[PDB]
Every structure is written in C-alpha cells, then in structure tokens.
Amino acid sequence: SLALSLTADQMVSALLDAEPPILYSEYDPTRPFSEASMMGLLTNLADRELVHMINWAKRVPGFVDLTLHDQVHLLECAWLEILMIGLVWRSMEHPGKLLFAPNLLLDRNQGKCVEGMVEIFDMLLATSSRFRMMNLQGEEFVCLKSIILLNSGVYTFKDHIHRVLDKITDTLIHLMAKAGLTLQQQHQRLAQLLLILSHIRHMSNKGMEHLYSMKKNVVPLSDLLLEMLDAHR
C-alpha cells in the first residue's frame, strides 16, 4: 500500500516519527543489584518496552497492510531482536556499558548478577562496539529495525513484505549516497550492516534460551513476555 509509494527521505521521516520513547527502570530497587532484583527490573522494563514496540510496528509503513495473523507472526519472530538492536543503539554513547534505561546503565560485571547473562551482555557490547566503529547513523538504525521486523519471520510462514524490504534497501542506499559514499562504499556498507543482523539473530536465539532457563522460576515473567516466549517453542 502507502509504503511502496514513499520517497527515501519520506520513508526515513515516517520511521524517525514512529520511534518509541526511551522508558525508565523502576527507581526502587535503587541499590547494588541481587539476581532476583536485577531479573525483576529487566522483566518489568522489557514488558513495558514490548507494549511500545507493538505500537511502533503499526507505524512502520507496510506493516498494517498485512493480516493480523502475519503481524502476530512477524512480532513473535522478531520481538527480542528488536529489543536488542534498540538496547545496542541506546548504548552507543556508553562504550563498555548497556543503557537498559537512563537510570539503568549496566557494566559487564553487573551482567554476572544473573547466571548465563554475561555471555549475552558480551555479545551485546561487541555489537555496540561494531556500530560505533561503523559510525552507524540514526537514519540507518531505524531502517535496520524495520528490516528485522519484516525479515525475521518471512521464511517461516510474502511478495508485499519482500517489496517493502526492497524499499528499505533503497532508503539505506539513498542515505549512504547523500553522506557522499561512492557506489562501491554504499554496497560495502549495505553488506556490513545486513551481516550484523545475522549476529542479532544469534543473540536473540541465545537470549531466548536464557529466558526459557528462567523457569529456575525465581521471578515470574509477565503474561506478555510468556506469550512471546512460547511462540518460539
């Protein structure tokens, strides 16, 4: 529908305007974190982020054109990849740290507070390092996030989704053309960016196994997180 019509510059504006807000952690606990308390904060935060993500997806040109069945499928497939690329983007300006929220900025060693989390932290930090090395721009980031949403479940059911993916590719190349990158540099950078999505898929699968491992059952997960987690079993 609407989405294929758009200008590259328009597509970027539609996607910048759709960006969900940055949410805050609960202030209490406001201490050195325990396993149970750290798990509590992250569960609460992820659950509120998920509600904003669902509403962001509806503002992604082309997504509302899909049937409810297909929107559900894409979101069940992509939700943790989307949380993770958001986390990685927010964490750009804090090398060696993860900005879960402005009042929840965690170092590698705080990763150890939960068992099996430091492995995923390290992968997330590595992705933040890579985005910085590439000088990832906000306009590219919003393109990558929409590609994850439309791409991650497309194989697991298509023509329309592939046409919108082609449009977001056009938009990324458009953006790199305007920064004055040569044709060679544009296709090189387009490749480097899309190869990161393979690493983000890997981190999502590791994080998903981590979330299944809880139930442990220290902290109950929200009804929404459990719904999304159970779409991956």
Binding site: V51, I54, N55, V72, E227, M228
Partner: peptide, 9 residues
C-alpha cells in the same frame, strides 16, 4: 493473546 489485543488497541 495480549498481542492480538494491543495490535487492535
């Protein structure tokens, strides 16, 4: 599904 609700809401 809560996901169905929020996608319609």
């Amino acid at each position: 599904k809560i996901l169905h609700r929020l996608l319609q809401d």
